[PDB]
């Protein structure tokens, strides 16, 4: 879902508990019920640990592979659902998603042609722009990259982003705040926490900084009715110490990171939970 001292995981569990006791019933787009709270934040340190949640096994290899696909700016689904309605027959066969996802991170606003076209120098590269500013002005308060839900792009002019990520630099540490307009607490939030924390380590590595904190803010923080019973069970589990993330080579540019450059260590989560 990345476009579409007390243990830090206690924040997450406390937020689950708060939505369960205090959330109000509210329908999503499809008319499916949620318990919802408006406005929440949590901070997770990245210093010498990596916030892969331990109360359930998080799909780390999937976090990593989806982020690397976003970074590459891909619109080929094969390299890796109402917006599909706006695609032609021929093109959604072959896996062409149109100008969506990492296309906005790397080529925001470029005239789209096809998923095998050459978009070098076309549109705003938000990602490289973030990295260049970290290097030219670390005090900058504008070090911001947004992601859109693909469904929204042709829906209106100036469509609101889904997520905005702000970076912040001080004492040679890089920190990241991700504000998401809505957050599926059971499924999306853990995956997103790992995803933006991983991006934070990648760019700290290339800019020669140290990871600092990851802050997650959310608008409509919600639990799907279906997820209530498994989440109640996850709450009674005790967090284990966060693992470490180790980058195994010196890497010079963002586009040069490969999935096997990363190693997670000392990850001992509780068993997987399947959320509908």
């Amino acid at each position: 879902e990345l476009p579409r001292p007390p243990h830090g995981e206690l924040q997450y569990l406390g937020q689950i508990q708060h939505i369960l006791r205090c959330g109000v019933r509210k329908d999503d787009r499809t008319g499916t019920g949620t318990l919802s709270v408006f406005g929440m934040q949590a901070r997770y340190s990245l210093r010498d640990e990596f916030p892969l949640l331990t109360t359930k096994r998080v799909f780390w290899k999937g976090v990593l592979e989806e982020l690397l696909w976003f970074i590459k700016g891909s619109t080929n689904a094969k390299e890796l659902r109402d917006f599909l309605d706006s695609l032609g027959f021929s093109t959604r066969e072959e896996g062409d998603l149109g100008p969506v996802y990492g296309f906005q991170w790397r080529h925001f606003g470029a005239e789209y042609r096809d998923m095998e076209s050459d978009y070098s120098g076309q549109g705003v590269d938000q990602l490289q722009r973030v990295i260049d500013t970290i290097k030219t002005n670390p005090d900058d308060r504008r070090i911001i990259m947004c992601a859109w839900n693909p469904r929204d792009l042709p829906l209106m002019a100036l469509p609101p982003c889904h997520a905005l990520c702000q970076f912040y630099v001080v004492n040679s540490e890089l920190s990241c705040q991700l504000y998401q307009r809505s957050g599926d607490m059971g499924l999306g939030v853990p995956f997103n926490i790992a995803s933006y924390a991983l991006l934070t380590y990648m760019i700290a590595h290339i800019t020669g900084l140290k990871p600092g904190d990851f802050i997650h803010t959310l608008g409509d923080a919600h639990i799907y009715l279906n997820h209530i019973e498994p989440l109640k069970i996850q709450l009674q589990r005790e967090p284990r110490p966060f693992p470490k993330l180790r980058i195994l080579r010196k890497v010079e540019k963002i586009d040069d990171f490969k999935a096997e450059d990363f190693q997670i260590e000392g990850y001992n989560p509780h068993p997987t939970i399947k959320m509908e």
Copy 2:
């Protein structure tokens, strides 16, 4: 600065105290020193009270008059500082600010001509769009309006916003979350709290909802070195009960609110503090 149970004010004072003890030295744009913390949030109820801070007298009449000017979409400064460098001689005489401030709330992206031109139907009206969506789909998670620092608009393509405001509706209550990329804790934050809370009441009134909560999130939350001594003094003051805000007529449209439609009641703040 709107484009450019325990008392809720305790949040604010606690945030001041945290920056004082835990903030790190960081320079702003001009090379002026701050104490800074990355990532902060506070919630203020709007139910039957209005969060005009009481530990110092807040300039309420100024909050009100600036918001009404933004709402009108004005670029005439007379109707009410590095970006001034990009203005011609003739035009910054007569008070023409160019396509800046409420121009983005009411005519985002319209080709600018002059501050007395007629922009009806030109560009995206973010404000009316927020109100129309509250009325057509209250569950919408996309009820978002952004504001830009005028300095940033011609600085780059796709310039990051300064503030994003998200609205949220449930049980016929309207709530608002304002995320600002940087927040001047001494001067801007109190004024902004009152400003977005006032906007929240105005739109709740026109959409027939009730005000709910106002949530303030900030990126780089900072105290100017100069403000440290007066803020230390403000901290030792005890908050008085928040006042009420009373709207004195039934008003049908956003553009129809006049400054004398509002009355603040039972406001008994501590004395004014002048922050440099």
